[PDB]
Amino acid sequence: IPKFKRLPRHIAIIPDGNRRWALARGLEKHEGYSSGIIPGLEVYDICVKIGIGEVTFFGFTQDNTKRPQIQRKAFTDACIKSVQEIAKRDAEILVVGNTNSDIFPEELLEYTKRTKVGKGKIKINFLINYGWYWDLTYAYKMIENIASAEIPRVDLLIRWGGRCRLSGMLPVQTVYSDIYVVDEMWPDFKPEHLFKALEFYQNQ
Amino acid sequence: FKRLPRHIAIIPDGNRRWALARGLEKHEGYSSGIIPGLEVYDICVKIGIGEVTFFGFTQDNTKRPQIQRKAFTDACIKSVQEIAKRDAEILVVGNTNSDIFPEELLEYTKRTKVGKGKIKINFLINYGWYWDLTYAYDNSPDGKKMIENIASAEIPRVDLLIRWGGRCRLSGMLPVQTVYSDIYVVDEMWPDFKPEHLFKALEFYQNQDITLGG
Ligand SMILES: CCCCCCCCCCCCCCCC(=O)O
Numbered sequence A: 001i002p003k004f005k006r007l008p009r010h011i012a013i014i015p016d017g018n019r020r021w022a023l024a025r026g027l028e029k030h031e032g033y034s035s036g037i038i039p040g041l042e043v044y045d046i047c048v049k050i051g052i053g054e055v056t057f058f059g060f061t062q063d064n065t066k067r068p069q070i071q072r073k074a075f076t077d078a079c080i081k082s083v084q085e086i087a088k089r090d091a092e093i094l095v096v097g098n099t100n101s102d103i104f105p106e107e108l109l110e111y112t113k114r115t116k117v118g119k120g121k122i123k124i125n126f127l128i129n130y131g132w133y134w135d136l137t138y139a140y141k142m143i144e145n146i147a148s149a150e151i152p153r154v155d156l157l158i159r160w161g162g163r164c165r166l167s168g169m170l171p172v173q174t175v176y177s178d179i180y181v182v183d184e185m186w187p188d189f190k191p192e193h194l195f196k197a198l199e200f201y202q203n204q
Numbered sequence B: 001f002k003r004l005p006r007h008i009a010i011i012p013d014g015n016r017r018w019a020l021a022r023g024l025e026k027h028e029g030y031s032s033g034i035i036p037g038l039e040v041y042d043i044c045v046k047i048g049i050g051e052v053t054f055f056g057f058t059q060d061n062t063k064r065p066q067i068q069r070k071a072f073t074d075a076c077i078k079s080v081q082e083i084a085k086r087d088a089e090i091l092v093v094g095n096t097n098s099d100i101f102p103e104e105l106l107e108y109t110k111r112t113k114v115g116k117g118k119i120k121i122n123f124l125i126n127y128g129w130y131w132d133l134t135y136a137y138d139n140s141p142d143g144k145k146m147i148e149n150i151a152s153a154e155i156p157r158v159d160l161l162i163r164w165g166g167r168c169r170l171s172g173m174l175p176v177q178t179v180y181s182d183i184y185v186v187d188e189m190w191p192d193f194k195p196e197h198l199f200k201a202l203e204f205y206q207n208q209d210i211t212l213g214g
């Protein structure tokens, strides 16, 4: 672990590339997501270590639910497991997303209010059945009243899978965010990816 | 080009750093930012891009020193006036309820056809993301309204955003329209614009895998 001069208060993670990763290894499109769980744990461990205040994970969106059922099952199960495995660890967990839906997993409903609030420990947010449109129109003041109001400004956003876009992640919080793209697919996560992103951030 | 974006956003950043690096004062770069805009336009009209939105300046850019605000305001006025000469449908979006908004651009705050028109050129002039979103929270009876009633409502979704000056960020440009926008960063400052910059950005967009969804 290298020594850092600047550190971002809030990191956003877009863990994209799961399907392409599976295809490139001769697996089915849906068989990459489960390999996304441990990388989530690695990012958590490294963040708690260097003392990052807040991390927001892109879980899945209402747009992602329009993908085939065998994929939706895979990334929903992968997301559920990811939250549960971070629940085990010492973290203030919040899940933001449209609960008023069959699609939202019952397992995660208990995290839609921040657990272990004000214990002076890292905050980990998950976007689960999230939509930018759903988020903004949640208001009915407004900026304070958006669904994602508890999630503050994003300083550094890191996306895996080589695509440079927000895919509708936190339009309000990301307005000024520095974006770092990793070309490697999420399941091919290396600690070097995160370190190189933190190096990019401190050079601003 | 096989694929073309319907709507390109331009963040013409790097003017001050470009000036400094040529032993000029910070404020003296912006005027060298006018012609590059004209070049982007010509190329966009040539290949038949439907819509281009230029980031002019924000309500945040007005907090900068007065010698700089003067310069980039004048550069923007001149850019619009020079595009107004050509064949474009021109719109300016920004907070007109302010001293800071240039009187010279008030007439363009409703889309204005000039020459043969066709291509839509937008300018963000005294723009702010917070102003844009809250514009809807005026007298909108529901949420289905708000999105349709944001200040920038007339500006549709952005397909490709190209930013000069080597920084990968939106700087609060059209948060609603940029949710799915592919972002291409040119390392060179805006005044150092070469056609190759735009052509590479259009290659990047063409090269995107359409199987992958949003
Ligand atoms: C929550 C951290 C670990 C999650 C493990 C993988 C399952 C999450 C699903 C990944 C897809 C989300 C990113 C898609 C981006 C896009 O829509 O373009």
Ligand SMILES: [Mg+2]
Residues within 6 Å of the ligand: B013, B014, B015, B165
């Ligand atoms: Mg700048």
